[PDB]
């Protein structure tokens, strides 16, 4: 029929695309990086362990100055720590206990948190009275919230749970532009340093590249066996790492739209939760539910030291902007700061 | 001892915040939590109505010096595999199944009967890997239609193997056994199988008896004797 022939054109185009992707690759990245040496064997010890939560921990985002951080937990509490002295600057009681994401504005005034309630709550921090208030309540998603990030004090990008990712304006709760291309729920997203493009990772084993102004998906990448649970960017805005549940991690390049080194081990059998880079993009720290945190080498697929101090699984991790710390949060209520 | 004035004030704020946080946690710790997996848009709603007298909707009732919190996840329309791990410490799972649900059209497939997908959803949670210790209660709801409908059509339409003669008691026993057999870990958890109705306000009391039993037996195992 007209539909049958449309699927035929679709499969023809699917093959035609793979033509060029193969036609571009000349030699593997692991073939070029034979020359450089091992990076070392990095062992870094825990410096501060801070304990105030009474449940699991599901999110953690560092500030814009590498001194303040915010942690979300199952009981309705969203603390705002101070990493140097390990005090507690603030403590926010929530409206719904069930939470799955936090976020810290790049200026320093706002903080966001949203979970299974389907709503995203923006919290004002510097007010005349002296208590933290709820400024807006953003509604419009039909599912749960996976990850929300800030562009400035007035715009925010939220990765839903049905199929969508939307861009908001804060003063008027209405949403401006909605990105609808996926086939399964979205789990994580990372923003580019230029702040014009962003990526998202679904549960149909895919990652896409969007355009924050135009509203179309320019590139789509494949090459996994199961869902993707984390995505980060290279400090240079040209490559992004992707975690998964098939125990592997992978590095993709936007200018080529190929795949690259596959940081897999034969002993690992479990999936991963979070993924980040370091300054200059030489290391790729990952978190595993085998109660571990492994450190790969972004240039040669070889492993380096590992970080093990946790009783239960690791849920989120992140590095700073000065590069002097990495923090990891577990289902055991504790949260640790590494060096 | 090298701290300044503002540092001492800063740590005083932290000590007070921590104390307040611990108190609130203790307050919330002594309050039983429940989960309500409907497994069908028809049966569930009545029970929450009788007990009271977007996404998650939570209800809060009291009975005989014990505070309850119920969570419902009816409308989510998402893969359950991703968010089900949030409910690990719940004391019980209230489950609802209809009786008139047999000989229904299913509105989508017209090849499968409703009670079969009910059984599949039952298995999925009774044998899940997080819910091994957590108990279950079955509130088989719409009997008022069952007594009327049993005589017109037998239970053989929805079941190949025989259910005996067609009388309310035998059919109720058979539908109950089909579910009760489904648990594999027969030594860890238990099922409580009430035959509820649309009246008489005993349905709130059955839950109190059940949850009391589960708390006391769990403590008995936690300390020695059992």
């Amino acid at each position, epitope marked *: 029929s007209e539909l049958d022939q449309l699927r035929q054109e679709a499969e023809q185009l699917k093959n035609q695309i793979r033509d060029a992707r193969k036609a571009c690759a000349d030699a593997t990245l692991s073939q070029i990086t034979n020359n450089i040496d091992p990076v070392g064997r990095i062992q870094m010890r825990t410096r501060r362990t801070l304990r105030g939560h009474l449940a699991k921990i599901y999110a953690m985002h560092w500030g814009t100055d590498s001194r303040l951080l915010v942690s979300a937990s199952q009981d309705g509490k969203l603390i705002i720590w101070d990493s140097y002295t390990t005090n507690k600057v*603030h403590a926010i009681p929530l409206r719904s206990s069930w939470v799955m994401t936090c976020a810290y504005a790049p200026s320093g005034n706002y903080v966001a948190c949203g979970g299974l309630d389907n709503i995203c709550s923006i919290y004002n921090l*510097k007010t005349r009275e002296g208590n933290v208030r709820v400024s807006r309540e953003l509604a419009g998603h039909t599912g749960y919230l996976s990850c929300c990030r800030f562009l400035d004090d007035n715009q925010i990008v939220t990765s839903s749970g049905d199929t969508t990712c939307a861009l908001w304006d804060i003063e008027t709760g209405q949403q401006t532009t909605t990105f609808t291309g996926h086939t399964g729920d979205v789990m994580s997203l990372s923003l580019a340093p230029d702040t014009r493009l962003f990526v998202s990772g679904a549960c149909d084993a895919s990652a896409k590249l969007w355009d924050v102004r135009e509203g179309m998906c320019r590139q789509t990448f494949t090459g996994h066996e199961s869902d993707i649970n984390a995505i980060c960017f290279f400090p240079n805005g040209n490559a992004f790492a992707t975690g998964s549940d098939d125990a592997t991690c992978r590095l993709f390049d936007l200018r080529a739209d190929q795949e690259l080194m596959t940081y897999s081990h034969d002993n690992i059998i479990c999936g991963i939760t979070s993924v980040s880079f370091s300054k200059s993009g030489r290391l790729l720290l990952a978190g595993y539910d085998d109660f571990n945190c492994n450190v790969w080498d972004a240039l040669k697929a070889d492993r380096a030291g590992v970080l093990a101090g946790h009783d239960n699984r690791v849920s989120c991790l992140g590095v700073t902007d000065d590069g002097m710390a990495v923090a990891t949060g577990s289902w055991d209520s504790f949260l640790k700061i590494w060096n | 001892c090298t701290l300044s004035a503002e540092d001492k004030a800063a740590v*005083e704020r932290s000590k007070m915040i921590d104390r307040n946080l611990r108190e609130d946690g203790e307050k919330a710790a002594r309050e039983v939590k429940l989960l309500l997996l409907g497994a069908g848009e028809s049966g569930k709603s009545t029970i929450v109505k009788q007990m009271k007298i977007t996404g998650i909707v939570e209800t809060h009732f009291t009975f005989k010096d014990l505070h309850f919190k119920m969570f419902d996840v009816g409308g989510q329309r998402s893969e359950r595999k991703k968010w089900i791990h949030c409910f690990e410490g719940v004391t019980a799972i209230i489950f609802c199944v209809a009786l008139s649900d047999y000989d229904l059209v299913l509105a989508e497939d017209e090849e499968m009967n409703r009670m079969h997908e009910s059984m599949k959803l039952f298995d999925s949670i009774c044998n899940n890997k997080w819910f091994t210790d957590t108990s279950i209660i079955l509130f088989l709801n719409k009997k008022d239609l069952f007594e009327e409908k049993i005589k017109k059509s037998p239970l053989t339409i929805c079941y190949p193997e025989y259910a005996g003669s067609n009388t309310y008691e035998e059919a109720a026993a058979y539908i109950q056994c089909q579910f009760e057999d489904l648990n594999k870990r027969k030594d860890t958890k238990e099922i409580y199988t009430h035959f509820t109705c649309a009246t008489d306000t005993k349905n709130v009391q059955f839950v109190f008896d059940a949850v009391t039993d589960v708390i006391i037996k769990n403590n008995l195992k936690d300390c020695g004797l059992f």
Partner: single-chain antibody, 234 residues
Framework: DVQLVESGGGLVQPGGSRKLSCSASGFAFSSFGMHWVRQAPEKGLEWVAYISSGSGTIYYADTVKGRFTISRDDPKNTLFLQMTSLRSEDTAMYYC??????????????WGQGTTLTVSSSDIVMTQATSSVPVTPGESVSISCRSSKSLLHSNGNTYLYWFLQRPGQSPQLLIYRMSNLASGVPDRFSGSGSGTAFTLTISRLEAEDVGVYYCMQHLEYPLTFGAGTKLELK
């Protein structure tokens, strides 16, 4: 609004006692810690008492170590101060203030409206060498302040708060730790200091800048205010 108001006053012969009360209006009184400052007829300020959040630490000044007592009532939103044996050197306004202490916090934001009291008939001294200035409108002018001990600390930040007071009002907070700037204050003023010699420079002189200017320190606890520096329009 952050409105704060004080009450009690009148004349009391030596040895008598009175009591002062302050009522707060809508700023979450329980979290803040309050102080009590003073002002003789035509003189500088000085710091009389203190009480924290939680009625924990209590601190007093030297002259009033034994005569005065301070207390707070968490519900009902009021602050009290009771003076038992009264001498003749306490005829002054009494000016409540507020203060919240955390990482980025700005102490001494708000200031009361004051009362009056007429009876009958180590420390870090800070100088503010100049007394008065012939300042003319439209030109930049600067004010000096100094100290005995270096106010810098091992943490990394100094402690020098500048204030401003127009004739017939209550003080405002301008720049809290040197080179910061308080909310709602125009962008003209500047911190610009280091070690043990601090200054303050304003770009243009509008008419409102007339008044007195004080400098406070906040490292060690008996808190010393400087004298005045007056800016005369001419």
């Amino acid at each position: 609004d952050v409105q704060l108001v004080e009450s009690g006053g009148g004349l009391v012969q030596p040895g008598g006692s009175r009591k002062l009360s302050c009522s707060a209006s809508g700023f979450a009184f329980s979290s803040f810690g309050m102080h009590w400052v003073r002002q003789a007829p035509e003189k500088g300020l000085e710091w009389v008492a203190y009480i924290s959040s939680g009625s924990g630490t209590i601190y007093y000044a030297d002259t009033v170590k034994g005569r005065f007592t301070i207390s707070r009532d968490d519900p009902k939103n009021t602050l009290f101060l009771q003076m038992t044996s009264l001498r003749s050197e306490d005829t002054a306004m009494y000016y409540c203030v507020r203060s919240i202490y955390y990482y980025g916090s700005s102490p001494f934001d708000f200031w009361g409206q004051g009362t009056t009291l007429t009876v009958s008939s180590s420390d870090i001294v800070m100088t503010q060498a100049t007394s008065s200035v012939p300042v003319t409108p439209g030109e930049s002018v600067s004010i000096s302040c100094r100290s005995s001990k270096s106010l810098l600390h091992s943490n990394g930040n100094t402690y020098l708060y500048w204030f401003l007071q127009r004739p017939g009002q209550s003080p405002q907070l301008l720049i809290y730790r040197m080179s910061n700037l308080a909310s709602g204050v125009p962008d003209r003023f500047s911190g610009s200091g280091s070690g043990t010699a601090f200054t303050l420079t304003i770009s243009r002189l509008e008419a409102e800048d007339v008044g007195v200017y004080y400098c406070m320190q906040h490292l060690e606890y008996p808190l010393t205010f400087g004298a005045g520096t007056k800016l005369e329009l001419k």
